[PDB]
Write a protein that binds this ligand. Structure first.
Ligand SMILES: *[C@H](O)[C@H](C[C@@H]1CCNC1=O)NC(=O)[C@H](CC(C)C)NC(=O)[C@@H](NC(=O)OCc1ccccc1)[C@@H](C)OC(C)(C)C
Ligand SMILES: *[C@H](O)[C@H](C[C@@H]1CCNC1=O)NC(=O)[C@H](CC(C)C)NC(=O)[C@@H](NC(=O)OCc1ccccc1)[C@@H](C)OC(C)(C)C
Lengths: 306, 306
């Protein structure tokens, strides 16, 4: 029993974090096979950040201007290129600790673990979700740039996020590992609006299922509702519309608890309409939306990795 | 910027989790040097759990009745003993992945990371606190027994917790690595009350400091208060009494933010007396108490490990 926001074990990703330096700027890179991946703004000064011509800036640099350090072991750069907003530094040695990996672009609402690093050394790990407006609400200080987000599927690490910037909100923006930003953001120190965020409705329902499984069932009400009537409530409350796809993925949770999806929708409707009267659900006084239906299944299934 | 409940990177502890089997019962053990540590109730059946005579039960067992598996590598048990509520199995090979480690008994209010495992394979990682009533509110299913809690100080892993049981609350109880329970609990399937829990006041203040650092300052009020007057409010609200020791440890936070400890005490007093009016602090509608003053300093300092 019990429900906790749980991150993947970070061992396989720790053995891939290196420190990349170019000029005075130092940040974290990801070392897989004989390639090091890091934010391309490692090549910028503080002044360059206001309006960088990245192709121009990169031309001034050669292989030896890039210092890659792995702990204290240290790598020879023999090729460099820019893929969108990441740089790829070709080094002379494969990472002997390269896990089975792949690069994936995740979708809004999906969750992932973040290993926050500084100077190429891991600091801590926490779990979060790609918000529908393609930001994440993380914990990132100066030098955490290049820290990565990932999921683990038994032995295979799916890298999905690399940290690039903080916005004027304290929210965070970043790219996949092909260097394509999530969201409309660019890697420039110029005012950028995230846009209206919305609540991940299918994740809220999954959490509400997780609550029922763990004994907390006071919100379980008398009522039911329709998909369209519930959706009509979701949008006054800035919730993402619920589709039949969302119903289907909550199916397993529906059948383990014996509660139809639409009856949970109605319970969630009165919660949106009436508040919590200062009660809590799984130790929270807010409706929690960074658990996917798979995060719930996996936590009350006990799935392991290595 | 940003504030997240962050766990230590689990890499050093992953390389120590093994699977221990005795009879039909299987659980997790911790393999350091040539010794494997695990809950002594691995030696019990389901019926034994109601009232176990552990010394008697252990006499029926020999070295070869204990199957230790590390991934698929596999260990030869050449000695076994019972230290309080842990068994120690002497194996024929040192763990080549033994980190610099030590065993520590932590105090109520301190925090630690938990690596939840099943069958000796890590499943996920999350952070928590030893509640003042010596329970933890974790996420533990059948077979997670023997999963450990730890802190990391640069390169040194301080193991402080091993999971043994769930109580009739869904809260969790366990031992240090010398096998001494935290709390008044015994390893028997007999009704056991945790006792009244209280809120870790010095941790709440630290979080409130963390909030100020991250821009959230609406609760910062006009008032101040005295240690004794605040304490008189803390105990109607089941808060732990605040000592001058607690003031001193909040000192660094006091000086980085320029807010006297007693003025935060008064802000926290009206929060206890008046609620949050449905507002939030660092994305929570509850007063958060599983961040120590060091967890705060370390997260807005960017301390790394390896
Ligand atoms: C790299 O380690 C660092 C990590 C940042 C700094 C502290 N926390 C973080 O997450 N990242 C950068 O320096 C990064 C480089 C860009 C190329 C991606 N820049 C930023 O994070 C800035 N973000 C930014 O300028 O966004 C657009 C903007 C918003 C508001 C006002 C003007 C422009 C940071 C440094 O800017 C702050 C945090 C808004 C001051
Ligand atoms: C070992 O993997 C397993 C882990 C438990 C089970 C699922 N979640 C967990 O945290 N632990 C045990 O089987 C453990 C063995 C004891 C020697 C420590 N026993 C328990 O966790 C039981 N706890 C218990 O009996 O506490 C006293 C008690 C409370 C309430 C009623 C009677 C006795 C569990 C199995 O008992 C439940 C969870 C109360 C059913």
């Amino acid at each position: 029993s019990g429900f906790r926001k749980m991150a993947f074990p970070s061992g396989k990703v720790e053995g891939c974090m290196v420190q990349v330096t170019c000029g005075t700027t130092t940040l974290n890179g990801l070392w897989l096979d004989d390639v090091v991946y890091c934010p391309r703004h490692v090549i910028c000064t503080s002044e360059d950040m206001l309006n960088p011509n990245y192709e121009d800036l990169l031309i001034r640099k050669s292989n030896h201007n890039f210092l890659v350090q792995a702990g204290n072991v240290q790598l020879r750069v023999i090729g460099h290129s820019m893929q969108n907003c990441v740089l790829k530094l070709k080094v002379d040695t494969a990472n002997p600790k390269t896990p089975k990996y792949k690069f994936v672009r995740i979708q809004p609402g999906q969750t992932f673990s973040v290993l926050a690093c500084y100077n190429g050394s891991p600091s801590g790990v926490y779990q979060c979700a790609m918000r529908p407006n393609f930001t994440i609400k993380g914990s990132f200080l100066n030098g955490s740039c290049g820290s990565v987000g990932f999921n683990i599927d038994y032995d295979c690490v799916s890298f999905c996020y690399m940290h690039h910037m903080e916005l004027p909100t304290g929210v965070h923006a970043g790219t996949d590992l092909e260097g394509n930003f999530y969201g409309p953001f660019v890697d420039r120190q110029t005012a950028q609006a995230a846009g209206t965020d919305t609540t991940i409705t299918v994740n809220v329902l999954a959490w509400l299922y997780a609550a029922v499984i763990n004994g907390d069932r006071w919100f379980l009400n008398r009522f039911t509702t329709t998909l369209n009537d519930f959706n009509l409530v979701a949008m006054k409350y800035n919730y993402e519309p619920l589709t039949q796809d969302h119903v289907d993925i909550l199916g397993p949770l529906s059948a383990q608890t014996g509660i139809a999806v639409l009856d949970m929708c109605a319970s969630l409707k009165e919660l949106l309409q009436n508040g919590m009267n200062g009660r809590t659900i799984l130790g929270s006084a807010l409706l929690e939306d960074e658990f996917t239906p798979f995060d719930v299944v996996r936590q009350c299934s006990g799935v392991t990795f290595q």
